[PDB]
Amino acid sequence: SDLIPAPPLSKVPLQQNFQDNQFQGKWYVVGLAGNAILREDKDPQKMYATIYELKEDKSYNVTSVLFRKKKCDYWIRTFVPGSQPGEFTLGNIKSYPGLTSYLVRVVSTNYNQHAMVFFKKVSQNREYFKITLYGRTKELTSELKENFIRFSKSLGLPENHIVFPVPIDQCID
């Protein structure tokens, strides 16, 4: 493949004074953009949800729930606190085959309605990045969507790498 290069981290803001306890709970993925994310009219991406649970030791247990082949699929991972509040690395990285690097940065959030989170990983020596627009509900405003599109474009993503998953009711309620 050919991939749009990951942006330097200097183009990716960090939420100031990030509050780990307030970021906990369920978030819906209302927007998704990345260098391996592709818009698809034939079968448009369904919304999924991600649950953040703050463990005793201040890492997150992170569970994603997706409706796929008539069933609920669960993906679990551990985000370990990084150099600053709002940054994380992936726990137990040796148990993910091909994975040499995984970085999470919370870009912005108001905790009770929305968040943007930046992800970067190196897998099979290929550098992938994505931005998730999270909502506490399945809908967000035009203003928040446009902010997410503007930000995604500042990182070099064109429109067809920016998707808005369609709301569903299976699995994620």
- Count of residues making up the chain: 173
Closer to Cl ion at the Cβ: 50 or 108? 50
In angstroms, what is the minimal distance from the CB of 124 to Cl ion?
A: 21
167 CB contacts (<8 Å, ≥6 apart)? 28, 47, 138, 139
Name the residue with the smallest CB distance to Cl ion.
Answer: 50
For residue 106, give the 3-state DSSP assignment. strand
Q: Are 26 and 135 in contact (CB under 8 A)?
A: no
* Candidate ranges 49-57, 72-80, 144-152, 159-167; the one touching Cl ion (CB under 5 A): 49-57
116 CB contacts (<8 Å, ≥6 apart)? 106, 107, 108, 109, 131, 132, 133, 134, 147, 148, 151
Residue 35 interacting with Cl ion (CB under 5 A): no
Closer to Cl ion at the Cβ: 41 or 72? 72
In angstroms, what is the minimal distance from the CB of 2 to Cl ion?
A: 25
User: Which of 50, 108, 109, 152 touches Cl ion by CB under 5 A?
Assistant: 50
Where does this chain bind Cl ion (CB under 5 A)?
A: 50
